[PDB]
Amino acid sequence: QPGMLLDSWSRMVKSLNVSSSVNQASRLIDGSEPCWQSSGSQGKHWIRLEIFPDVLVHRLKMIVDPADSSYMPSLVVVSGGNSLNNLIELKTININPSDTTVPLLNDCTEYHRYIEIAIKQCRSSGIDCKIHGLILLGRIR
């Protein structure tokens, strides 16, 4: 029913992909430890979601931990589009060293089939990042 909110990940997300440590990716959903930790090139990490076409993003957030030192994300770019070849920047977020819950998207009025969370920088220029979970709430249309 249009307008009602959703919090069941599997009813909103068709697929979840990550740039590295693919075997750990499911930790982003339930938020358990040890969390997803990238194993790739500095500033090139990403998480990509495909969203079912009757779901708008009501809330999208990520959980970080200041105790992670140089694994803590510090600069994140969120993009969305109708294909992975059509991603446009939606928001650039500068994370502060003491942040824990990081808002990424809210109250989207446009449908995004693909959403990308790109970790462009980590605290103290760490190479890899740790993200302790994603929070997704959807609105049916």
Residue numbers in the entry: 2774 to 2914
The authors write:
The E3 ubiquitin ligase HERC2 has been linked to neurological diseases and cancer, however it remains a poorly characterized human protein. The selectivity of ubiquitination relies on E3, which recognizes a specific degradation signal in the substrate and accelerates the transfer of Ub from E2 to a lysine residue of this substrate. Our findings suggest a role of cytosolic HERC2 in the ubiquitin-dependent degradation pathways.
The HERC2DOC structure consists of nine antiparallel β-strands and two short α-helices. The first α-helix links β1 and β2 strands and another α-helix, α2, is located between β2 and β3 strands. Electrostatic surface potential of HERC2DOC reveals a well-defined negatively charged groove that lays parallel to the β9 strand and is ideally positioned for pairing with an additional positively charged β-strand of a ligand. HERC2DOC does not recognize any of the H3 peptides tested, or other potential ligands, including SUMO1, Ub and the D-box region of CCNB1. We concluded that although HERC2DOC and HERC2ZZ do not appreciably interact, a conformational rearrangement in the protein may occur when the two domains are linked.
